[PDB]
């Protein structure tokens, strides 16, 4: 029974994921090799820092990357579902049924399950990108990670998504909503109530120049210069050397006439802001402040990449060539005090829609503030599943989908003749781990909420369609209450891209484990 022992090793990891999924779940401490404490709900960090040897667990780790890269939600759905399929398969392995026909039973049940997922869709989003419409998608994503911030972070995240997402339809050629399109920053002090949403990237550097802010003119021209500010020299090498004190007067006076002549043509073209990616000389700050040009320095090359997607500016390797095609446009440039430090931000009003936004977070504890940043970053990739590839449809969540699939799959088990009926019936039983997981974490009795849940989905309707309840979920409450809530009350549902993609990954994950009857290794 070496194949059974491989399942027992996953059982230790299976109990680890039972405390992950759900808002009542538990957080794990991850101690990095550098002596840093890491505590997060998402289990992909745990599997990344822990190298796996045995293949059965390693396939589940590689299957986690399949869910994590393509979607920002459902990492715990694959680990829990694939782990239970091997636990319920121990009854068939014991009886003597070979693991070959066990795989064939899941393949027939997978096609029957994916066909029923299209009929589980109740509502559909119109892609209006309204402030209230984005709350329905983001609300279940914030859940199962951070508790108590679900209502607070709903309005903060939905505001930045609508700014970076244009309104268009019937166009699939140009991709939208890049991963880097949303940046999240944090600062100590204040609270979540004082947090605001910025329409552009926030710069933490101070305005060293004498010009604090620009004027009220519309569409301020901004220039991004990679070359440092100095006298014009050769692009290749061209290092200025000092020999005698007589040449010092020519070097100082030489830089005064050249810089003033190059910056005069820039100010005449309407460019009030110059972005210098390198160091700025002392003489450069003198001429730019008299012409009203705000000095902005960005030494980090990572921030200049996302800036090109906002105003459309391009970095110039040389200096002194104000190309109009490389110039950007910004509506308003001011300097605000964030967290006690005055910094120059980047934003705009009612023009030149930006593809990059930044959310400023404020919290009392820096440890819990970092976990909120990871929960929002994980919520960004969850929005990617709303695109053209079946992002409009939705399925009932909070354990409502796994219960309905039980009566659908078990109905076809006894109907389909042959030996495949044994694996089909056990395939629907493995879905019982999802409602039991939410019941154990919430402290509810497994002998009360779980058995009474099947009575709600089983009714007698004088018709050919079971109806009158689509709303029966699993109770997530921490206080004793009679019965369970409804899906329509809290609007907690699962996306089609999350549910449908997790099934194909979970079946292939458990198939590889059942396909291995032995291992072959060599000496290192």
């Amino acid at each position: 029974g070496q194949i059974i022992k491989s399942i027992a090793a996953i059982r230790e990891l299976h109990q680890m994921c039972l405390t992950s999924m759900g808002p009542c779940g538990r957080n794990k401490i991850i101690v990095n090799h550098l002596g840093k404490i890491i505590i997060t709900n998402d289990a992909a960090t745990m599997l990344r820092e822990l190298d796996i040897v045995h293949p059965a667990v390693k396939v589940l780790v590689m299957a986690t990357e399949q869910q994590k890269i393509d979607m920002g939600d459902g990492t715990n759905l694959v680990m829990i579902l694939a782990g239970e399929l091997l636990n319920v398969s121990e009854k068939l392995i014991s009886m003597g049924l070979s693991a070959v026909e066990i795989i064939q039973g899941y393949n027939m049940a997978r096609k029957f399950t994916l066909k029923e997922l299209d009929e589980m869709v109740v509502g559909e989003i119109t892609d209006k990108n309204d402030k209230n419409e984005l709350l329905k998608m983001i609300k279940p994503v914030i859940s199962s990670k951070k508790y108590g911030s679900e209502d607070i972070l709903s309005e903060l995240v939905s505001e930045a998504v609508s700014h970076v997402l244009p309104v268009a339809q019937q166009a699939g050629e140009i991709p939208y909503f890049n991963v880097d399109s949303i940046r999240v920053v944090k600062i100590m002090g204040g609270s979540l109530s004082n947090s605001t949403v910025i329409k552009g990237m926030v710069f933490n550097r101070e305005p060293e120049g004498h010009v604090k802010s620009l004027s009220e003119d519309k569409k301020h021209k901004v220039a991004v210069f990679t070359c440092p500010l100095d006298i014009a020299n050769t692009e290749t090498k061209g290092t200025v050397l000092l020999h005698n004190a007589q040449e010092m007067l020519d070097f100082s006076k030489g830089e005064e006439k050249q810089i003033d002549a190059m910056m005069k043509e820039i100010a005449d073209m309407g460019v009030e802001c110059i972005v210098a990616g390198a160091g700025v000389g002392e003489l450069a700050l003198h001429y730019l402040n008299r012409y009203g040009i705000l000095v902005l320095k960005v030494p980090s090359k990572f921030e200049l990449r996302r800036l090109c997607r906002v105003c459309g500016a391009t970095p110039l390797p040389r200096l002194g060539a104000p190309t109009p095609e490389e110039l950007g446009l910004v509506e308003t440039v001011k300097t605000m005090e964030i967290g006690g430090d005055r910094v120059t931000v980047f934003k705009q009003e009612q023009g030149e829609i930006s593809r990059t936004s930044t959310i400023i977070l404020r919290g009392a504890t820096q440890n819990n503030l970092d976990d909120i940043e990871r929960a929002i970053d994980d919520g960004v990739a969850a929005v990617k599943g709303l695109m053209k590839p079946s992002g409009g449809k939705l399925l009932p969540g909070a354990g409502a989908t796994e219960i309905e699939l039980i009566s659908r799959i078990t109905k076809y088990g006894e109907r389909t003749p042959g030996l495949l009926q044994l694996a089909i019936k056990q395939f629907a039983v493995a879905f019982e781990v999802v409602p039991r997981t939410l019941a154990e974490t919430a402290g509810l009795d497994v002998n009360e909420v779980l058995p009474n849940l099947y009575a709600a989905h089983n009714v007698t309707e004088p018709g050919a369609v079971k109806t009158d309840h689509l709303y029966k979920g699993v109770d997530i409450d921490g206080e004793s209450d009679e019965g369970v809530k409804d899906i329509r009350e809290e609007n907690i549902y699962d996306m089609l891209a999350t549910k449908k993609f997790a099934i194909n990954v979970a079946t292939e994950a458990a198939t590889t484990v059942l396909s291995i009857d032995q291992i072959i290794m060599a000496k290192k």
Binding site: A232, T234, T236, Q258, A261, M262, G320, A321
Partner: protein
């Protein structure tokens, strides 16, 4: 080395060396416009290694 008397001459020195490459570039863009340039469903791709 590149020695420029004026700021506008610096860009002319770099364009003078590229003009040798741009001389062969003009024959490439003129080949597409000479034969079926405005005809639809026709294009040209530079496979240059």
């Amino acid at each position: 080395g590149f020695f420029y008397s004026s700021a506008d001459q610096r860009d002319k020195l770099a364009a003078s060396e590229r003009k040798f490459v741009d001389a062969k570039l003009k024959k490439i863009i003129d080949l597409k416009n000479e034969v079926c340039g405005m005809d639809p469903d026709k294009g040209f791709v530079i496979i240059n290694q």
